[PDB]
Design a binder for this molecule. Structure first.
Ligand SMILES: [Mg+2]
Length: 204
DNA sequence: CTGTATATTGCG
DNA sequence: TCGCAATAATACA
């Protein structure tokens, strides 16, 4: 397989296209048909002392007993469904890595987005890679170094930007998530939905 | 002079 | 349209 390697100080990621257009279309269609997203109380987070409905849709699937907590919200995983098992298994065969959990974020259009954060969970296994699989509209994905944020930053490490295309895989390897914040910024010109799956290895 | 951390507002 | 510092109120260590 041919990878585009994304390297910088404390940044170690790789990008590849897994599926051609026809297959990625079929997978996207099946995801749209089958994935059940959280609503209501399970779609609200607390950040900086205020509660917000998330500006997107979220779903969690994976092995029994696991939980996923961030920003005052705890999500329980739904049992695996065939479309998700298909992708999980393909990623595993391509990378040599295993996953027991997937977070699904759906961005209805360019106005849907996700703010800056690190995936520095306690429930995430130490040094475990994260596999980010994208379907639908291409969206720009942004890495920012932790020491380069704020009015008076410690460092001036350049922002790393990557478009994530339909049918693509972004592998985020250790120690990417200790040093770098990532986000999916608003892109007003994007009119079409995007579904992103982040496969992870969660501790019970 | 000085603790660390975290969705939209309010600019530019 | 885009980017980004400041910060909704606490919760730590
Ligand atoms: Mg993340």
């Amino acid at each position: 397989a041919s990878w585009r390697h994304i390297r910088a100080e404390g940044l170690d990621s790789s990008y590849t296209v897994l599926f051609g257009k026809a297959e990625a279309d079929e997978i996207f269609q099946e995801l749209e048909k089958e994935v059940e997203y959280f609503t209501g109380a399970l779609a609200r987070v607390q950040v900086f002392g205020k509660w917000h409905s998330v500006p997107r849709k979220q779903a969690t699937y994976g092995d029994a007993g696991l939980t996923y907590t961030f920003s005052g919200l705890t999500l329980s995983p739904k049992p695996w469904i065939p479309v998700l098992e298909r992708i999980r298994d393909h990623v595993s065969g391509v990378t040599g890595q295993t996953f027991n959990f997937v977070l699904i974020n759906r961005y209805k259009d360019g106005s849907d987005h996700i703010g800056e954060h690190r995936d520095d969970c306690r429930e995430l296994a130490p040094g475990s890679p994260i596999a980010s699989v994208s379907f639908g509209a291409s969206r720009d994905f942004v890495f920012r170094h932790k020491d380069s944020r704020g009015k008076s930053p410690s460092r001036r490490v350049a922002v790393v930007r990557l478009p994530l295309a339909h049918g693509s895989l972004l592998m985020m390897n250790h120690p990417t998530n200790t040093h770098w914040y990532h986000s999916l910024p608003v892109r007003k010109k994007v009119l079409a939905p995007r579904v992103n799956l982040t496969f992870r290895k969660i501790l019970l």
